[PDB]
Design a protein around this ligand. Sequence first.
Ligand SMILES: c1ccc2[nH]c([C@H]3CCNC3)nc2c1
Length: 330
Amino acid sequence: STGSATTTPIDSLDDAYITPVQIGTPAQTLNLDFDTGSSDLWVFSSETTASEVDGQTIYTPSKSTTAKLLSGATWSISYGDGSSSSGDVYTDTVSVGGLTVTGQAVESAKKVSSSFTEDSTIDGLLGLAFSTLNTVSPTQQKTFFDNAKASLDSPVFTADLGYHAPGTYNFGFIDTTAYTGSITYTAVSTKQGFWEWTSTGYAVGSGTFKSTSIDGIADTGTTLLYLPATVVSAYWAQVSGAKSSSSVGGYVFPCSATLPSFTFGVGSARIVIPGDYIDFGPISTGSSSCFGGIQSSAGIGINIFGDVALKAAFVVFNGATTPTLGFASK
Ligand SMILES: c1ccc2[nH]c([C@H]3CCNC3)nc2c1
């Protein structure tokens, strides 16, 4: 089997991407944030605290003839950005772009933090990291990909995120028309439950390539590119007037600037992030200070190849017995 679904930016800055997902019988379609950096499929629901729901579409398990309470199961998750959610668990039929999994753990939110409430466009998350990170207790549950894998034509999914445009998540096949040149594959460590890999280096604009190992994760659920402070300083030093602002919480730059590209290495291959991808607009409405799309990972504990990096590539998440990651230009 295969599946193919369109993923759409939630706003003009590509702050996140949403993908329609069918849950239950008859189908309830929710728009979920596909997140290769976490492993829980959770949704706004009929069980979510009423004051914490603001415009989201909710899952109502009582209206699904295939929903079953997973007795005694609870979940609770906190993401690196301060956000969190928690609740109980159903199993139900879940379909993405024509690919169907029966008995998928659908984690129903009883509580969500303010940042989730404030995103009216995101109805929940669909985790695509390794199932060892799943937070359901006392019986850990499998991701949608993990459940689908044996049935897929090939045990893979691909992320093709657009810049200011829709893109595609495919399951079970590689669309050879969706990228240019070849796909370069690189080793993955699953030791921390992430799609963790080692970039071979970077360049700023037309500058020389610096060969240096940068361990990080491929994370579709993180907006920006978070890299070591040395690398990030080298980037913003090429932008006149750019500086790190403790009050704003990262590097900012004059909105009148023209941003240089940023290149990262995948083996001997190179992925080029155009300068425009690194612009996240005025820090507040009407401001001439703009927020940068490359930021320091110093306070995080891990480097994160988020959407800013990933949307410059066609990315293969290869879930073979020994997982690997593939990157192609597009
Ligand atoms: C900013 C700070 C911390 C962050 N942690 C994350 C990801 C890492 C894996 N799941 C959450 N994005 C972040 C953005």
